[PDB]
Structure formats: structure tokens, C-alpha cells
Design a protein around this nucleic acid. Sequence first.
RNA 1: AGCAUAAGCAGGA
RNA 2: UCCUUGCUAC
Lengths: 511, 705, 249
Amino acid sequence: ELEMYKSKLFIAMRDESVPLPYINYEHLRTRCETFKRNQAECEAKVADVASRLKIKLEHLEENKLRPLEIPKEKEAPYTHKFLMKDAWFFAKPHDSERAQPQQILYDFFEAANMGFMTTSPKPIFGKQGLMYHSLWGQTKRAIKDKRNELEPSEQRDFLCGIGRASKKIQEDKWQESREEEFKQEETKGAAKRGFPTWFNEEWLWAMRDSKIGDWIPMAEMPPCKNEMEDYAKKMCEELESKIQGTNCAREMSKLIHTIGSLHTECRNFPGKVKIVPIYCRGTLRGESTDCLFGIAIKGKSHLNKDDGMYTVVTFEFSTEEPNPSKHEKYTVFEAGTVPVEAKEKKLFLYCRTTGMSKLKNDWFSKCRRCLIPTMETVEQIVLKECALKEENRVSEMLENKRAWIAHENGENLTRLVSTKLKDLCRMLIVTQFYYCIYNDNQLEGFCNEQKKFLMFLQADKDSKSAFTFNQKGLYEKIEECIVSNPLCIFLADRLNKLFLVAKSNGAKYFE
Amino acid sequence: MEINPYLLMLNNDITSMISLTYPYTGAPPMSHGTSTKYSMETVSRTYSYSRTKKEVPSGIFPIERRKFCNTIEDKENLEKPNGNVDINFMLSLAEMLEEKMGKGFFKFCANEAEAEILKMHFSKLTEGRQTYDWTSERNMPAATALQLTVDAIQETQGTFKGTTMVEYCNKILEMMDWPEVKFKKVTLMITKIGREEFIKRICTINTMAKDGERGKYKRRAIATPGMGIRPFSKIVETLAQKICERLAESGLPVEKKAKLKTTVSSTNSKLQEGQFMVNITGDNSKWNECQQPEAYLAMLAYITKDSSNLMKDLCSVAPTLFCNKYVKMGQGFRAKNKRKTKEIVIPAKKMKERKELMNAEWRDLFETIEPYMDGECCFLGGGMLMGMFNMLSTVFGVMTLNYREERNCYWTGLQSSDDFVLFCISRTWPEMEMTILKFIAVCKLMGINMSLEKSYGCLPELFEFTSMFFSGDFVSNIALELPAFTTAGMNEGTDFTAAMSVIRTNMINNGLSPGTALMALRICLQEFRATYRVHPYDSGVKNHRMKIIRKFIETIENKDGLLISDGGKLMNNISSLHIPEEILKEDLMDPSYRNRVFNPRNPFTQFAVVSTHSFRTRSNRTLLNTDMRAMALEEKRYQVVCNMYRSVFESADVNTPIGSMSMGEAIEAKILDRARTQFENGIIGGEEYSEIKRLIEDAKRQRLS
Amino acid sequence: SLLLTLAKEYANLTKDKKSCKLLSQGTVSSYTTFKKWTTSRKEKNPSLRMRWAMGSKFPIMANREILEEAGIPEQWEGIDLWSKKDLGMVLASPAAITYWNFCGPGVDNSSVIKDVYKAKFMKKERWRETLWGPMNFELVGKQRRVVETQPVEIKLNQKEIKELTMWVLFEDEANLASKFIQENFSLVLSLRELYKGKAVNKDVAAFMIAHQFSPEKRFLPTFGPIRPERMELLHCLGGDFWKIEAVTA
RNA sequence: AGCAUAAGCAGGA
RNA sequence: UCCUUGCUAC
């Protein structure tokens, strides 16, 4: 039983891979069985303590928690694929028989009249005007004939990238030439941008209640017993009845319908360029309506791997004057005039080429899950309240409780805007939704390091006299991942403003 | 008006407003292209952490060997991490460990460990994650790589009769003694391979890019072992698993919350009139480049000093297989011209000949690694990469935490894979500097580098351990992943109940308050309805499946007995997450509906919940057009043979079919056995028994020839 | 008359040339590593491929001869239910599934269905007959235990159950005769009075035996009493910040 | 062009 | 040298 197969190359291998003061495994095994320790251990340890030169850094005496380094360079552009704050939709009553997205597209060609949708071939600003003009005329006469398939022209062959691929040549034939086709490789990285100024107005825009009502397609409430199910049904009805009306839900519905339609078109028809509308569905005065925000165009997605980055060309509708700092990646054209009753304002057609992938199609088309952490946060607050008081105080506690947010701009110090607890849900859904959009590497690393700083602020709140070992390398790890994501730079700045407001009470910080 | 979402933390804790700071509602970052640079950074960074140049030549391998223990060239930058271990110091720590609890401690844990190894079957190696097949040199699941290994054994010399762990390990070592090993390449040609090349191929570890790691800015390369390393690592993980289950300062198996209350309370009951406590949250950095398997070899030689003669040599082979591993270096890089028009591909073989087509960083990392490169691989001999020994390094941490120097100032704590919590007790602050620098001294000698950037401390309980931020009284829960609520995707019947099971197990283990439970239940209901195109009957949806339901709803009497897959409403709730939807609704169904749904004469199911919507979607289309066509046909053969086994032993998927004779002889002997038992109390007919006997004898003569 | 069919299948499979190198060259236990040969990597995105599967017109593989016995080629307005593309198995649509469920044949099998699932109908029968009360809103929480969670009446420990189903269903290749048989052997007699004549297959029978005999003991956070009846009422009864219990009987 | 971030996708048989 | 085609319902 107790016999292992003593092979030859394994014992000649085990004898070769012992530590250096030993010759064979036999000498090591005979030394390890007869080992007794000594007190040269403490001498070696203290001889390691002396050659160290390491001091710990308190905070009450060297409160060097300086504000973070936001880059002072060119402003970070608008990087989301669709338009949030500047959108314009045409409405019609929803037909149930005409419910496929291409039929919505046709019925909006008769509803939102594209005959008045003339564009001049000279844009206001941007890069490529004639290609977008001929593509918009070509796709508009494509919708006019009631079929969504672009015949091959020069404009679509230039815009959605066809034939724009390097020749992947394997190393079986290379046919080297003397001083001709000198080849090598080089990488660059990512360029650095600055603090966005448009981001606050879209934060306050998105949680403002929009009269078009329910946007997100939720489901039915199950029946309840005399259990705790009254608590769950009540929290879901109040929180859901608050968040269904806001302008964040319009964008969640816009991503679900538009990117879900692009997802089924990317499965069914690779190798053919389709036309997908950009639309929502919401209840106007009880009459169910569907909207129309733009026209999106696919780019022959042969999704082989989980990547693929197929090219979507988006024509968008807006009714505001553009901005070369915010709308930097667009190619802003015009549209015409729209009667807007309280007189007849302008209408700007926008253009942009962009790209998607298989994974972000799977993650954007299921953004309804952003409702899941939000309520969790809210409910934790409520539960801890009754856990401190041992009495059913939930309904009036969502009414007589304030929650700080949103200090003003000229002053910050102890000038805060408290709201009710229930309206708090609005703000929270917005930030969860922004984590769905702006997710990068930079946002991940930034979120770890901000959890460290939040631990420092909690130690300051209760006077526990925290300490650090190396602040310089700490800030040299946090400042590496603030480059060009708008959410990362915005949240770093608001973290600094938390340090400015919190500096008025507890002393571990700077100005 | 500005806006700031952090201001809630001005009058709250980090146990309620800490779920807000995780970006878990968005996509994890994936990797793109070759993974050569990350592997070069791993290996070259390990050799930079060797702190030596003591190289020793080799007789087996054609490459030089650098030593990693007791050979230190002490730099002045000692705050930089070292990867050099002193073995007398660490054996003094293990001897200091066994003098704390019991006397025959390691003998007890080793006798239980070998007691569980001797009753272990080798098919347990198929119940694991993906492994590396060196036959075709790819990544495959465990059962395919095991059967390709046994296929190479039975094709090379003889057959296999093992059916245990120990005889399979002995079979692998016997395969090391063979002069030539033969297998099958692709269209199934039969090739051979030498002896030194088989050693170079049995010790190959395949590296790739770790995809989907929430919380880092730069990517990292994860590594997967072969099949000749997995049983030995299974043995060592059983040994260290028993040791860690016996200890009282570890947090791997799991309660992890009772232990911290007992050590915070039990060490807060041990203060004098002037002493105090400081807890320090730490994080060990470069954990996979500073754990050498040579100290593992010495320590595992120390634990089993009085166990056996089998276990003493069987727990000393995986460290010897980790001191001489190769590393696959990915798949190369790509060159292109000035116009960015033609882009040639250079694989990992010809990277040495095309050395002068690289960058500055690639030539730096490649010239710190050049005399250790083979043709395809590299020879690392001191690293402990990801997907390896994870319960033994925790024993190193508990050894660093049980140090005794002889005042009355000391420390305790709790250790995990690479996250420690250190509790210190002393009297004044410069003595706290003395004790903490003594802790960085003992960890620094043994090979454990605390990161000075990610570590901090406080006086009472305000620490952090495995991403659960413990404040002074309360504890926050783990921020779980969101897509795990909907990952079934097989059926209209095994989705909604599986989602209720995931909601239930996340309600019991984690917090998951009732409002989040009802919301997550309703969102999973909506993604189910959007997936399979079924909406309720009173909705206005008019597609190809609601036209039939809306046309035929007048036949169904009790309308709220319909299934959710047939346009029914919701009756499950938080208090019904263990009762499936079908079994909850069979008290209300119409008899025509219920007898029509659950009919086993259905064209879809024929050829845990009730099986009546269970269909199978069609297969793919490019699986029979590539050069790997016939391999698909190969699995068909296995299925056919398994079906024949299921035709004989009528209860075989219940009990595990052990045995070591053959599969065909048990079939034929079984048909003769039940032919005799059903003969004498039963059959009785000469033409049937003689015809069955004639078919068994003809099939046996056909099988033997 | 099954052994003649088994002889025809065994001679039929030894008729093949390269299949004779497969059997009588491995071992019995290799059946396990013959069962698993999934050459796909992980099926890493199942719901993604499920929605892409359900986006087509004919996603399902369905039998022909059962569906041509009763079903209809197209429904009353353009709804396709059938194909002619390909073993003789025909692609189909889930509109044929719901068309089967509303306009198909029916067979009374409620006794077999209400007898296979006795554990689950026992769970619903115990769930309907309980009464609740008010909440508490108090701090609560306790350690993790190993608790048996099912109200069985036999309480075996996953070692007498496998050996029990070997010595009830098919005894020709059961086990070596152990010491655990004798007294429970009397119960074996009772089991041979139950599972002798049924239309239930032996995999479904060996499934349904282990749900009246096995108290599922798991490692769960428990609090209050540790009665085995109230362990689905563990996730129903209390969490971390709240608690509801007023069960009288 | 663009997506993207330390290296890829922007067809292939 | 050559460019096959899948039919979309929140």
C-alpha cells in the first residue's frame, strides 16, 4: 500500500530543485525532522527592523489630505451614444397591429413629415458634410419606398467601414524586401481631458419630472398575505410611482427599445445594412403613444467574438443651438422649423458616427436592473431607523426626514439643500444609471480608491485618530486613473467638494 | 445650484452608503489582442524580485536555474518588495505554531488527510474548471483533457487498470520514465514524442488574460495548469484544507463574522491599566510573485515528518513540479507598415528571430527575459501564479501572526488569501511604531510584502476584510453581481423558478431586504416575458403567440390558473420562493388545460421543476464545416456507447459505476446473468436462448478479432 | 423479449469497425469520463443565445410523427408552425407549443403527477395551512448552523439512500452485503410493495424516493428555534433588521 | 472616419 | 477567382 513509484527523472528532478544550502532531498528531509529553534531569530528580526527607515503618518498633526489633481486642459466632450438633454420627439397614437420597429419607422414617415426635412449641404460645423447629406437623402428615399436596406453607394461605403481593414498576413510567406516596407509596431495610450461644465445641468435635468407619464415597461404586483408583504408592496409602489415619471426613465426606455432592436437586427441580418428607428413608448393623457428620437443605421455586423465594434450611424433630432465644446464629436446640420405651442422654433438635425459591440448590447438592453440597487440603499436607511427605535415608523418617516444634497455654487460651506427622504430615490436612480453608461477602467479604479478616502472620512467623523503609511504613493495611484471619463472627473471634483464641506467640522483636511 | 451625491455620508455610516460606490450596474472591462506583454511583465517582474543572481546549471533542462531561497543580495531599498525566503526563520515559525495548540497537531491533520486520500476515486478530477490539453495544446474542460490523457496512456504502452488516485499518480511518474510517448494529431494521425520533450510538455502552464475583474485599471494574466499537476495539487489542498479547518485565525472555508467578534472581544478583555489597541487594515502586494514553492517544499517536509512513507513522498511532488514550470507566452505581436495598410503577424515561436521589430518597452521586458526563454515557453521557477495553492499561503499568514518575541505588547489578527487584519496591543505610540515595524520585519523576512499605499489603521473596530466594511457595531454586506439573477437560458420552464432560487439564496446568505426582493422578482419576470415573447392575456400585445391565446381564451374557465409561459399573471411572492409556479397553480387549472399541458405524448419533450415546456433549441451550423468536424462525430460515438451501458444496467445514473475490468465484458456477463435468472423462472425457449447465445458469441468473436 | 433486442443492439454496435477499439479497452469508471465530452468551452452567455434563438422563426427541434397526428401546418392567419428541413426531426416555432397547449389532445395523468411530486405538494400543503401575525422591527442575527431542512419521518444520511435505492429498484448489481440492510430490509419489503407496478421510469422513481427520505441539511444563518418545519420560514420569517413570527400551532 | 485603450475590431472562403 | 442568406412584435 505504502509504496510510491520511485521513478528516475523525478528523483533527479527533486534533487535539482532544493534550496541552496542543501545537496539532495535526503539531506533536507533529515534536517527538517530534527529541527529545534533558537534565539538568533530575534537578532535577525531586529537586524531587519534597523535597516528599514519607515515612519507612520498621523493626521491630527500633518493633515496633508490635499485635494485631488483634476487636469487643467481641454474640456471633456459629450460621449454618450444618444442625446439626453437636447432631444426632440415626434408623437403618434400607438397602433397595436403596426408594432414592429420598421412599421413604426414607416408610420412615422407619414406622421413626422420628412418632406419638409431638407438640409443644406453646408453644415454649421463638423467634419464631413456631403457624405452625411447624400446618406440622409439616400436613407430618406429608402424609407419613402417602404424598405429598409441601403443599396451600395459611395456614401455608405465610406461611412460604415467597408474594406477598411488591414491585411492579416501570417508568417509563412513574408517575402522580405531590401529597405522596402520597413515595418514595426508602436502604441500610444489615451489622451487627457478636463472638467466638464455641461454635466451638472444634465444631472439636474435627468431627475426632474417630465405631460407624458410611464416609460419603463414594468410588470404586475403579486397578491399579498397579512405578512411583511405589505411592506414590500408599499415600498415598490411608492418608489416606482416616483421614478416612472422622470427624464431618466425616458433614456432607459430609449436604450431598451433602440438597442434591443439593434440587437435582433445584428443577429438576423449580418452583411446587410439596416435602418432602425430611435423611439420610446409612453402614456400621453392615458392614450398610449410611441415617440421617435432619431434614425440609426447598422453597419454589417459579423459578430464573430464578444467584441466586434460595428459602426452605427445616428441621425438625431434637436431643437437647441449647438456648442463646439459640448457637441464636439457631432457633425451638426439643421432641419427646419417646428410649431411649438405654449411659437414656431427652429429644428436642428445632428449627425454622428459611432460604434457598438456585442457585450454592451447585452448590458445596455437590460438597464432596467438599475432599479435593483437603488431601493436597497433607500430601504437600508429606513430599516436602520426602526432598528434604532423598535416601532413601525415607515410611512411618516418617509415624510418627516431630510437628506442633504446639492450645495450651491458660489458658496459651499454649511449651505446645503435638504430634501424629503422619498424624493431621494430620484437622485439615486440617476447615479446608478450613470454607472451603466460611463463604465470604463478608470471608473473602476477610481471607485476602489474613493472607498479608501470614505474610510478616512468616517474615521474623522468619530475621532478615532487614523494614520497612513505612505501618502505620496497613494495619490500617485489615485491620480493615474483620472484621464478622460466624464463621470470620473465629475465625481473626483464632487469628492473634493465633500472635503471642503466636511472641513468645517472635523480636522483631517485642507482647503 | 451644484449637486453632490456624497453628502448623504455627512450624517450616515459606511455601512449604508457603501453600496452606492460600486459601479456594478455596467459592463466589466474585457481584454483585447495578445497577452504576451502581461506574461512578460509577470515573469520578468518575478526575476526582478528574486534579489539575487545566483544561477545554477541544469542537467535535465537546457536552461539555467536561478535560486530563490537563502541567497540574498541585500539592497538598501528594502521597502521595495523582496521575494527571497529564509527557511530557518520560517521553520522556527512553524515550530512556534505547533507549540501553541497541541503536540501531535500535524500528525493528526496529516492522518485525516491521508485517510481521505486513500478513499478517493480519480474521476473527481473531472469535477473541476478548465484545464490545458497538451495533446492539441489548447484549453478544454477537465473530462476531455483527462480522457485524452488516458487515451495517450492506452495508445502508448498497454492499457489502464487504475481507478484510484494513487495508481494514477504512479501511472504519471511511470510515464515520466518512458523513452517515447505517442498520441493522436489532426483525420486522426498517430504521432510520437521523445523523453525530454515530454518533460517539457508535461510541465507547461498556459497563460491568458483575466477577463471581467471588477476593480482594476490595468489587466492581469491568469494561468491554467495541465492535467499532470491537478491530482497532486488536489492532495496538497486536502492537507492544507484540514489544517485551515482546524485553526482559529483563518477565513477561507466559511463563518468569518463570529471569529472577528470573538477575537475583538477576547483581545479587548486582555488590556492592562494603560494599554490600548490599534487595528490596521492591510493588503499584501505582489502576492503571486513572492510565494516560492521551495519554502512550500521545506514546510511540507516539516508537517509530514511522522505520518507515513507514502504521504511523505506524495505531498512533496507538486512543489517540485512548481519549481520547474514553463509558461506559454500568449500568441506574439503584430507588425505593420508606415501607411497602416498591411499588418503581418509574428507568433511566439519566431519572436527571437524578429527581435528587432519591437518597441522600447517590449525590448526592455524581452531583454530582461531572453536567457530564460525556450522556443515557445519560458522557465519560471519561483512564482506561484493564479489558480494554484490558495489554502497554504493562508497558513503562511497565520504563521506570521503567531510570532512570539519573549512590556507586554503583541498582536493578533485574521488572515485570508492576501488580505489581513492586524490587531495590535501596546501602551504608547513609539512602542506602536516598534511593534508594527516588527510585524513588517517578520513578514518581510518570510516573504510577505505589506503594501504601504493601501493600508491604514484606527483605534476601535473600523476595519475592512474581504470587502465587508465593518464599522463600530454594524456590518455591511457584500455587493453581489447583478447578471447572476438571469443566467439560466435553456427553457420556458427552467427559468423563472431558477431565478426564484437565486433570489432565495441571495436572501438567506446576504441581506437582501424584502423590497429589493420584490423588485428583483418583478424585473426577472419582465426579462423572462421579453425573452420568450409571452405577455398576459389582458395586455394589448398582438404577436404570433398572443393571437392563439387571445383567440382561445374563452375555452379556459378559471383564468388565473394559466401558466406565466401561457399568458398568466403572477402568484409567487417572497413567501413562495420555494414553491414552483406549476405546482402552485395545479389546484386551479382547468382539467382540459391541465390534461393538455402535462401530456407526455408531446412532440417537443420526447424523442428541479415539472417537465412540460422543456424543449431543445436547434444546434449550430459551422460545427460540421471546419477542420474539427469529425471530433464532433467522435462525441456521437461516446454517446452511443454510453446509451448501450444505460441499456444494460437499468440503474446506473444513481450510483457511481466503479470497476476495473472492461465495459464490454460486464455487458455480456450481465446479459448471461439475467438470461439465466430470467431463464429458469421465466423465458424457457430454445430458439430465443440459443439465438441470444448465438448473437453474444458472434459479437464476442467479432470483438476479439 | 428485451434480451433479444439487447442482443441485436450489442451485435449492431460490435458490427462497427472503429467502435470496437472504444469498448473493452477502457474501464467501467471511464463511463463517467465518457459521459462528459462537452467540446464547447463554458456556454458563457446562455440568456444571450436564448434571446437570439427565440428571435428567429423556427428555433425548436420537434418530433414529426406525433405532431402530424394532430397538429395543423399553419394557423388561421399566416402563423407558421412547420418546416421541411433537417434523423427525422422537424424544426418548429413556439406558436406550435402554445397551439398544442390550447388546441391539442389530452391524457388524464393527475395521479402520477400528484404522486411524483409528493414533497413539493407537501410543501404547498404546509404553506397554505399556516397563520402569521405582526412584525417586530428589532435587531436580530445569529451564527451559521448545519440544520436539516425538510419535515421527513425517516432521516437517513445520504449513504443508506443510495444503497437503499440499489437494493430496491435493481438488485442484480447493487452492492456488497453490508450491516446497514437488515432492519431497513423490512422497509425494503414495503418498498417492493409500492414500486413494483408503476408506469414511472426507474430514474423518475429513484428521483422521487430520495425526496421523502432525505432531510436536506445545509449551513444557514438560523435564529430562534431550530424546528425543521420553519426552515423555508427562515427566509420567510426574518432578516437582519426585521422579524415576523406569530405562528400559533 | 469611428469604437476603443498599452491592442484589437472595422469579413471572409 | 467569388461575394450565399436568416424576416424583427416590451
